[PDB]
Amino acid sequence: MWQQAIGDALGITARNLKKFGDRFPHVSDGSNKYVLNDNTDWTDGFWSGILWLCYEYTGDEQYREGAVRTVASFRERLDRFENLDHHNIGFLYSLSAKAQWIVEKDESARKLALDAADVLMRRWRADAGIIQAWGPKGDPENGGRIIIDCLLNLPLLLWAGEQTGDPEYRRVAEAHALKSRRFLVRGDDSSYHTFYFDPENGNAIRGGTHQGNTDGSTWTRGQAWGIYGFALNSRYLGNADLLETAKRMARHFLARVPEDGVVYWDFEVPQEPSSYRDSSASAITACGLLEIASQLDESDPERQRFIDAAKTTVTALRDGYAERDDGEAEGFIRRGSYHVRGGISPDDYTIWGDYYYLEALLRLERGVTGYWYERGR
Ligand SMILES: CC(=O)N[C@@H]1[C@@H](O[C@@H]2OC(C(=O)O)=C[C@H](O)[C@H]2O)[C@H](O)[C@@H](CO)O[C@@H]1O
């Protein structure tokens, strides 16, 4: 039921590794070809994650070799602090270094992940009680701004805390998760993309976005980050409130899935065929649904409902958005959107969309849960 979908991803990935060399895919821009970078963006870890997933599925060393090479690249990136002045250190190092530790217990990889966690820890702003999303400390406009995607960067910190025994990691992570729950999540179970607080005292200012249609709309990838993010933090923290929030956001998302099963870029714009989609939001949500289900009691009827929703989502992606390995295509699923409002790759491959699509497939076919936490954690 999932073997052919995975087959195409494996073939595309093998072809990509040879063509990309040491470079990393980010997004496409109007074609079936990925635009590459020299490990300088916030998405490079997704490539590493894809390679590790392919390796876990096949046992084929070609994927391992590629992943190991990206890990070496990340060692270099960390040691010269290249473009790491943001909270996406988790996206970058959980899926590469921590991933290798999870896959084969590589000690050097574990150390690299820990070193990265250390850097991310310094993004914490005591006076605001939040992890600064972007920019340097005291940034005039982003000094007290949190983004919902930060929830997916907390796993690196939580994992490091359990590895070192240092309670500060869990302390800042839970504080940030709870603050996110109170101010980023809305009363109708939708969510704001970002939220601003007074850098001095941490007072709540306003919710807003530069990506969603409007400050009060519902950017689908944002909602998706919330679904998977809150579920990942709930697992680590054993916090029933965060799990409940993940479920609430999931139901809100599911109630607004269009006819073909894959979401538009924002729930509050006309849900019309000519509008941009965001297949990556659906891929992320598929993973979040499975993560939520994995935390529910087997006697909870909603558990299977979420598992079925995830399967339906992956099937919808496979049927109407997945690329077949035709020897040319470089992405797994079409129609992801990076920055619609900015006109940046609004109908393209997104490496994160590809990673989550594959993670969902590996979860369904092999029970492989990605690299957000230890297997059995
Ligand atoms: C916020 C930041 O540090 N940089 C901005 C980008 O923020 C990233 O956005 C996304 C996303 O699109 O899903 C995920 C990451 O968690 C988040 O840090 C933002 O995407 C771009 C515009 O697309 O502006 C900044 O680079």
Swiss-Prot record:
Signal peptide residue numbers: none
Pfam families per UniProt: Glyco_hydro_88
Activity at various pH: Optimum pH is 6.0-6.5.
Description of how activity is regulated: Partially inhibited by divalent metal ions such as calcium, copper, iron and mercury.
Temperature dependence, free-text field: Optimum temperature is 45 degrees Celsius.
Record: active site: 88 (nucleophile), 149 (proton donor)
Key words of the record: Carbohydrate metabolism, Cytoplasm, Glycosidase, Hydrolase, Polysaccharide degradation
Subcellular location: Cytoplasm
Physiological role: Catalyzes the hydrolysis of oligosaccharides with unsaturated glucuronyl residues at the non-reducing terminal, to a sugar or an amino sugar, and an unsaturated D-glucuronic acid (GlcA), which is nonenzymatically converted immediately to alpha-keto acid.
Annotated protein name in UniProt: Unsaturated glucuronyl hydrolase
Organism this protein belongs to: Bacillus sp. (strain GL1)
